[PDB]
Each structure stands twice: as structure tokens, then as C-alpha cells.
């Protein structure tokens, strides 16, 4: 945004917008002023003309027998070409052009400007009505082939319109990219499940036999029974989970609040959920204000409350899905980046397990739209034998089971009035996902000292161990951290598909190719984009990750790694090679460009070398969509590794969000730790005989937690004291703080714990009779018990 003069000139030259348009601030942002999309719309026809003229030119070249390569810098903005300097001759009618670089570099601009809108009109004319498609049509394969041949004629690779015929995940991505491009033309009502009326013991039923994805094409179930007498338990379950009967038996619904695609309602009215405020706890407030707290000017106050929510808020929160947009990705560098990221996860193990080996925690919780009326997950877990689960798992490896996802409002404490939402997921999805992924998830969680730090506790010195491991041999180390504005609500679905692909790479022997594809299809049908029961009606989720699933964290971690790696690749390759330092890096860049756009298959040794280079000059510590980076600074001075401007550009062209740089933080020192990570501020103090890093939390959140609670849970702390014990454990590192207010907070907590305990003892000893023979409760008011939580031995 600091230097976009060429783009402004181009926009004002071709009547895209008037020059006055650049006065209103944030014209370049997507979330702010989403009208920018209507500006980039008036460039699509130019791009389409350029593509047509490129096809003409390539045809003429191959007729006249010329050999050469084409690059974007030759074509003007009207399609005409020039600069034939490096073309050679051959026998006529045998010349071949090479255009992979051209197309691959051009790809992300196509959907950004929406080039292919003119294909939906009557005769490819903007001054004409729309093609009135037949309602029952659901195949469209021939139109896919027509479009791909008309615009991408000389792309030398096999393209299957239906990804079920591909040979490997590489082919899956290569075909799904084009599918994402094309299917923005066809009507929206022809996507989703495929129903078929069947008869069981002379009864009409509406079931689902397949799905028609926006990017995988058409998938048909293998084993489908038309006629039957009586149903078993598993079939009952899969039919009740399906949205088919609920959708058909319902009534037509038109919703004018949101802009998403409605489907139907189920009742004859609409619910209106609200979030009631919290409960106050006076006696703690009095005890706190007595010890000289909450005075004017003191550097501590309340910034954490229980905000109240009115009626129509669930819909106005669901409306934030409108920020999800279809987007192509450069297939070449995407394949390279996924290869490197696969190279990252080479220290774990996954595989299919049986129902006996499974582990389930907290079974007494909910289970979806169907099934939330009758018990909890424990009921269905016990009611089914092990063979039932084995058969259900084997069935999903050969079919597709769409489900419904319930929406709900959260009840907690934060610092802003924006609502929150959890998502209830059906139960069959849970059993299948657990049986499929559990081994790899445990392997990831248990391992210590890796790029991903999920499953590592901050107590007993773990925080210091992590902060040392990220601090590797960095010549001029610095610390940089960034943020993803609306990560879940704006995730492009191509990356989500690729992430679910990476996790499945470990299933080399446990599963076949077709089984792997069916599992991927099930995952896309169940978690990625499917029917979200909000309020009392049904809707359709355009995309973005859910929250009630079991693999959101790992998926987000893989996505973050991919973002960082592709930003590094982009940063390196946009630097003039004539002013580079010692040969090594310049040779590496040359090799990179070759292995990226000229080589067709994979090259392992260069992957290892680049991975080692990244480890040498880029260290990442990764949580779910939260990361801290230690990078060499002299390299970044010349733009040979990542930097915040690179992240801004990558996000702008790959996620359709403008990450303002005021949100990031950059640290030059390494004595003090990261400025913030997982809502913890890192401090370096003397413990024992040396210096260690301790994570200390913000005080205001702790005080707000102490004051405002729900009812009876802490309306009188005498009933349950372990709350104030647990709160104090996280407040102890406030003692070593240079400013003394935080130590005062810790002391106040100790005093209150002591008072609560003694007054409870008095209450039960006086009005009741017997409590006391041994105390054993001294430990809960001395720092000796607390500081054992950070001693590096347990």
C-alpha cells in the first residue's frame, strides 16, 4: 500500500474507477470496503482477450514450425506479441511452444478479476441474458472439457474432469485446481448430495448415493441397496445421519437476512438464542478493594467481562462466511511447497487401527443434529459392539456420508463484544476420524523438540526448553511474529484439501489408492463444506475450517508452515542476481527456478538442500495459527529470506485478506523473550543458580476471572476453593516482576485463600462438630509449594 502507483495508473487509465476513488481510505482492503471486488471485475474481459490471442499465436507458431518459449513481459495489454529474437526453425507443422511458466504465473489473477464471467452468458456476450440451464442436470463434464480445450489448449498434461480417475495426489491437486476455476460458471443449485428414491419392504425412502463437489467432480457410491426387507443398526444410523429426509420433509425457506444459500427449514418457526450476562462475586471485590486496589492511575484494571448478546446474533455471526471466496493457486510452486512441507513431517508414524486400540476422553458430551435428543456420545459408544465400528469404518472407505453440523453460542469471558460460536459435529464422523487418525495424532503430541509444539507443557521448565530450541545457531538473530486476520472464516479450500492430503501421506501400506480417495472425499463432505443447522433451519457452508472437529489444530499448523515456506520462496526469487553475495546463494536460486518451472517430476536432493538451508537461516516454533520466528537479520536485509512485507503480499494474493503490519511485532533483542505467544509475556529472571525464562500472564484477565463468574460455581468460594488454588498457580510468576503491583496481586490471592480456608474451618467446627485431626492445608499459603511448578525436575 506504500507503493502502488502502477496499479493506480492502470486502474484509472482503462476506466476501472475514477481517480477520486483513492481518497477514501482502505480502498485496497477486502474486509473494509468490499466494493474493491467490483473494481477488479472490470478487468476480466481484457484477460480473456489476452488468453484467446495467446491461443491463436501458439497455433500459428506450431503451424509454421517455430520453437521457443513465451513470457508475460512480451505481451502488451491488448494481446499482441513481439520480440521473436530467440526463436529457431524446424520442419513446418512440427514446431512446439512451451507455456508452463506463462500460465502458472498468470493463474492467481484469473479468479481475482473473475475473467470467466462471460462464459455464463447466452453467447459469450456481456450484453445478453444468462444460459437457462436445466434444473435436473448434474454432470457438466463436457462443458468442463470444452472450456479447458478452448482456453488451455497447449497445457501439456492430462486433466481428468473427475478426480476419481487420477493416479496420485499430485494429479489430484493438478486437476482440482482447474476444477476450482471452472465450476464458478455453473449454477449453484446443482452442487451437493445426490438422492435416489429406494424401496424397503414396500416403503418409499429418499437416501443419498453420491456427491457433486465443487472441485472433485462426481463421486458415486459403490455398494447401494435398492430393495431390502429390514434394516440393521448401522444402516439405520447412516440413514438417520443423512440430510436427505430432513431436507425433503421440510418446507421451502427463503432467508433475506444473510446472503448464503439457504436450503430449507424444519419447524414452523425460528429460534432466537441469547447469551445472558455473568454473575458477580462481591466478597472478593471487597477483599480486593480493602488492600488498596482499583485506585485511579494504577496500572491495573478490568478488561475482561461477560458481554451480553441480544436476539438475532447467531445469524449475523454466520454472515461472516461471506469473506470466503474461490481462489486458484499457482500449481507449480504449490506442488513444490507441499513437497517441502511433507519433508518436514518425517519423524512420526500413522496407520489404521482397530476399535479396541482406540482411546476416547470425556464421553459424556454431545453428538450432532440427529442424536442430540437421546443421551450423549457414551450411549452410542457402548450400544455398538467392536464389529459394528469395524464395519462402519470399512463402509466409509467405499462410500460418502454427508452429515449436519449444529451451531451454538459460547459462554465465556473476553475483551470485545464480538460473539463466539462452537460447532457440534455428528457422531459417525467422530468414530471414523478417530479410528483413521488417532495413531498419528498421538505420535505428534508425544514427540518433544520439533517444529510443532502441540502437547508440550509450559510447567517444569518446558517453556524454557522450547525457547532455547527455537534459539538455534542464528548469526544475527531477531524475533518476528505475525497474525492471520480471520484465519478460519477466510481459509481458501485448496490449502485445506492439501493439508488433509499431507496427513494421509503416512497411510502408505494400511490403505489402497481408492480407499485413500474415498477417505479424503468423506473428510471434505463432512468437515470442509456441508450443511450447517443454524437457528432452526439448514444452510450451506461455503468453506473455511470448522471448530468442533478433532484435527483443526494440526490442519492449521500445516497451513501455517505452508504459508511461511511459500513466502520464503517468493521472497528469494524476486531479487536481481547481478548484485548477489557469494556464489552459493545465486547458484541455489538458479537451481530453484529450474526445479520449479522447468523440471517436471520431483528432485529430492535439492529438496533436502533447501530444507537444510531453511533450518540454517529460519527457525519456526509452530502452534495452531500462532508462531514465533527467529531469523538471521543480515540475510533479511538483502531480501534473501522472509520479511513482514513478504507476508503481507502472500496473504493479499493467496487469502484475500489485508494483514495490516501494525499487528505484527519485531524484536531485535534476545535477552527478553518473544513479546507475546499464547497470551503469555516472557520474562527472564534468576531462579536457583542461573537465569531462566518464565511465562507470566496479563493480570487484568486474572482479576476479571476472580471477580465475575457464573452462579454458585464461585458465587461463594467457600464451597469450592480449588478455583483460587488453580488461579494462583498461574499468577505466581507475577512475583518476579520489576513493577510491584503484580506481586501485590499474588499476595492478595494468598491472603484470600487463607481467609477462605480458615472461615470454612470455623463454620464447620462451630455450627457442626468435627473436622480437624491433621491440617495438611498449610501448603496452600506459602510460595514453596507454588515454585515447585517451575523447578526443572518432576
Amino acid at each position: 500500500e506504500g507503493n502502488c502507483d502502477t496499479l493506480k495508473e492502470i486502474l484509472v487509465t482503462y476506466n476501472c474507477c475514477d481517480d477520486d476513488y483513492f481518497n477514501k481510505k482502505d480502498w485496497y482492503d477486502f474486509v473494509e470496503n468490499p466494493d474493491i471486488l467490483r473494481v477488479y471485475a472490470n478487468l476480466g474481459e481484457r484477460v480473456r482477450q489476452a488468453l484467446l490471442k495467446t491461443v491463436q499465436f501458439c497455433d500459428a507458431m506450431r503451424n509454421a514450425g517455430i520453437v521457443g518459449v513465451l513470457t508475460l513481459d512480451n505481451q502488451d495489454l491488448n494481446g499482441n506479441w513481439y520480440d521473436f529474437g530467440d526463436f529457431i526453425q524446424t520442419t513446418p507443422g512440427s514446431g512446439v511452444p512451451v507455456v508452463d511458466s506463462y500460465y502458472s504465473l498468470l493463474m492467481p489473477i484469473l479468479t481475482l478479476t473473475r475473467a470467466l464471467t462471460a462464459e455464463s452468458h447466452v453467447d459469450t456476450d456481456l450484453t445478453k441474458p444468462y444460459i437457462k440451464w436445466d434444473l435436473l442436470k448434474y454432470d457438466f463434464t463436457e462443458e468442463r472439457l470444452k472450456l479447458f480445450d478452448r482456453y488451455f489448449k497447449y497445457w501439456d498434461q492430462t486433466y481428468h474432469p473427475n478426480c476419481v480417475n487420477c493416479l496420485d495426489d499430485r494429479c489430484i491437486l493438478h486437476c482440482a485446481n482447474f476444477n476450482v476455476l471452472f465450476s464458478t460458471v455453473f449454477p449453484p443449485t446443482s452442487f451437493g448430495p445426490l438422492v435416489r428414491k429406494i424401496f424397503v419392504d414396500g416403503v418409499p425412502f429418499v437416501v443419498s448415493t453420491g456427491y457433486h463437489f465443487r472441485e472433485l467432480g462426481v463421486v458415486h457410491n459403490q455398494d447401494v441397496n435398492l430393495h431390502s426387507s429390514r434394516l440393521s443398526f448401522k444402516e439405520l444410523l447412516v440413514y438417520a445421519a443423512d440430510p436427505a429426509m430432513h431436507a425433503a420433509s421440510g418446507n421451502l425457506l427463503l432467508d433475506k437476512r444473510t446472503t448464503c444459500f439457504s436450503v430449507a427449514a424444519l419447524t414452523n418457526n425460528v429460534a432466537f438464542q441469547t447469551v445472558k450476562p455473568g454473575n458477580f462475586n462481591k466478597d472478593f471485590y471487597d477483599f480486593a478493594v480493602s488492600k488498596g486496589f482499583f485506585k485511579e492511575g494504577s496500572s491495573v484494571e478490568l478488561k475482561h467481562f461477560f458481554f451480553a448478546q441480544d436476539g438475532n446474533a447467531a445469524i449475523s455471526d454466520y454472515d461472516y462466511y461471506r469473506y470466503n471466496l474461490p481462489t486458484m493457486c499457482d500449481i507449480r510452486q504449490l506442488l513444490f511447497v507441499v513437497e517441502v512441507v511433507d519433508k518436514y513431517f518425517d519423524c512420526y508414524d500413522g496407520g489404521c487401527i482397530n476399535a479396541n486400540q482406540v482411546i476416547v476422553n470425556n464421553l459424556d458430551k454431545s453428538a450432532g443434529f440427529p442424536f442430540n435428543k437421546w443421551g450423549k456420545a457414551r450411549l452410542y459408544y457402548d450400544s455398538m459392539s467392536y464389529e459394528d465400528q469395524d464395519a462402519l469404518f470399512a463402509y466409509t472407505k467405499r462410500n460418502v456420508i454427508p452429515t449436519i453440523t449444529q451451531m451454538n453460542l459460547k459462554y465465556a469471558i473476553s475483551a470485545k463484544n464480538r460473539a463466539r460460536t462452537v460447532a457440534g459435529v455428528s457422531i459417525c464422523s467422530t468414530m471414523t476420524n478417530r479410528q483413521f487418525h488417532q495413531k498419528l495424532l498421538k505420535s505428534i503430541a508425544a514427540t518433544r523438540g520439533a517444529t510443532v509444539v502441540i502437547g508440550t507443557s509450559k510447567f517444569y521448565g518446558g517453556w524454557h526448553n522450547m525457547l532455547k530450541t527455537v534459539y538455534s545457531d542464528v548469526e544475527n538473530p531477531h524475533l518476528m511474529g505475525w497474525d492471520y486476520p480471520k484465519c478460519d472464516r477466510a481459509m481458501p479450500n485448496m490449502l485445506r484439501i492439501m493439508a488433509s492430503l499431507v496427513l494421509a501421506r503416512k497411510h502408505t501400506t494400511c490403505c489402497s489408492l481408492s480407499h485413500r480417495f474415498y477417505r479424503l472425499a468423506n473428510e471434505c463432505a463432512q468437515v470442509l463444506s456441508e450443511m450447517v443447522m443454524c437457528g432452526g433451519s439448514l444452510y450451506v457452508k461455503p468453506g473455511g475450517t470448522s471448530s468442533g472437529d478433532a484435527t483443526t489444530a494440526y490442519a492449521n499448523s500445516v497451513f501455517n508452515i505452508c504459508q511461511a515456506v511459500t513466502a520464503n520462496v517468493n521472497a528469494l526469487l524476486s531479487t536481481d542476481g547481478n548484485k548477489i553475495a557469494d556464489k552459493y546463494v545465486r547458484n541455489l536460486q538458479h537451481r530453484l527456478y529450474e526445479c520449479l518451472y522447468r523440471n517436471r517430476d520431483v528432485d529430492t536432493d535439492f529438496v533436502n538442500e533447501f530444507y537444510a538451508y531453511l533450518r540454517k537461516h529460519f527457525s519456526m516454533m509452530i502452534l495452531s495459527d500462532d508462531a514465533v520466528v527467529c531469523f538471521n537479520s543480515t540475510y533479511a536485509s538483502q531480501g534473501l529470506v522472509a520479511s513482514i512485507k513478504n507476508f503481507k503480499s502472500v496473504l493479499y494474493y493467496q487469502n484475500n485478506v489485508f494483514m495490516s503490519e501494525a499487528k505484527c511485532w519485531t524484536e531485535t533483542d534476545l535477552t527478553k523473550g518473544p513479546h507475546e505467544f499464547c497470551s503469555q509475556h516472557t520474562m527472564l529472571v534468576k531462579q536457583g543458580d542461573d537465569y531462566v525464562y518464565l511465562p507470566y500472564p496479563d493480570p487484568s484477565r486474572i482479576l476479571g476471572a476472580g471477580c465475575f463468574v457464573d452462579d454458585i460455581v464461585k458465587t461463594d468460594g467457600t464451597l469450592m476453593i480449588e478455583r483460587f488454588v488453580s488461579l494462583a498457580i498461574d499468577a505466581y510468576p507475577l512475583t518476579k516482576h520489576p513493577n510491584q503491583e503484580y506481586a501485590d496481586v499474588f499476595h492478595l490471592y494468598l491472603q484470600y485463600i487463607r481467609k477462605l480456608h480458615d472461615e470454612l474451618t470455623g463454620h464447620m467446627l462451630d455450627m457442626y462438630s468435627v473436622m480437624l485431626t491433621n491440617d495438611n492445608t498449610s501448603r496452600y499459603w506459602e510460595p514453596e509449594f507454588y515454585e515447585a511448578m517451575y523447578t526443572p525436575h518432576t
Binding site: S190, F233, D255, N268
Partner: protein, 142 residues
């Protein structure tokens, strides 16, 4: 051994008996949920079998059709939620209107609190006097 082995047998028998009582309870609950399954399934389906569904299924090439059209053609009752008066102005003006290439007749207009509202009350001046997730159910006029 007469005062240790007998108690061991007592304990193992008692814990086994509690376990198999729990198992019997599990079987009973399984049967109850199975009955709920089949009764729900059989009672929901008996309110959809319009012959229009058979019509449109027969017109299909093999039978399979997109789900997003079944309530778009065979469903008999349409509910419309209107944010404000201006949207209501050019969406459902008059006692009847058309949508999805069919005619619909207005039957009953409720508000957020499920209080029936007369069509006269819906005016530009009277607008700041009603809860405004208006719900307007309607019939398939023909």
C-alpha cells in the same frame, strides 16, 4: 484360607455381577434407541409423497437428482424472513406474489414474539413499532 479365599470369591462374583447388570442396562438402552430410530424414520416420511416428486424423479435420466431442488419444486409451504420494511416493500407486496417460478399466497404473518400482525399494520410510518425478524409463511398458490 477359609477366611481369605471365600472373600476373594465374594469380591470377584460381586464385581462381575455389577458388570453384567450394567451390560443388561446397556442392552435395554440399545433397544430403546433402536425403537426411537425406526419410529422416527417411519413417521417422518408419511408427509412428503406428493406425486410431483414421482413426476420429477421420472423425468430424470436415471433417478439421481440434486438435493437442493426437491424442496424447490415439491415443497408446499414457503417461509420468508424479512430484515426490515424496505426489503418487504419490493419482495412480498400484495396478498400474493411469485417466486421460484410459481405463485404463492400469503397466509398468516407473525413477528419475533410470535404475535399475529395484520397486513394493514405493515406501513412505512408504523414500521418502528414491531419486532423485525418478520416471518411470512405462505402456500403454493395455483
Amino acid at each position: 484360607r477359609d477366611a481369605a479365599m471365600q472373600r476373594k470369591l465374594e469380591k470377584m462374583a460381586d464385581q462381575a455381577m455389577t458388570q453384567m447388570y450394567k451390560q443388561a442396562r446397556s442392552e435395554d438402552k440399545r433397544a430403546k434407541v433402536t425403537s426411537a430410530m425406526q419410529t422416527m424414520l417411519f413417521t417422518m416420511l408419511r408427509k412428503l409423497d406428493n406425486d410431483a416428486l414421482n413426476n420429477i424423479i421420472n423425468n430424470a435420466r436415471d433417478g439421481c437428482v440434486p438435493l437442493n431442488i426437491i424442496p424447490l419444486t415439491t415443497a408446499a409451504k414457503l417461509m420468508v424472513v424479512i430484515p426490515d420494511y424496505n426489503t418487504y416493500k419490493n419482495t412480498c407486496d400484495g396478498t400474493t406474489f411469485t417466486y421460484a417460478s410459481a405463485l404463492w399466497e400469503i397466509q398468516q404473518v407473525v413477528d419475533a414474539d410470535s404475535k399475529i400482525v395484520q397486513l394493514s399494520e405493515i406501513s412505512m410510518d408504523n414500521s418502528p413499532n414491531l419486532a423485525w425478524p418478520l416471518i411470512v409463511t405462505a402456500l403454493r398458490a395455483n
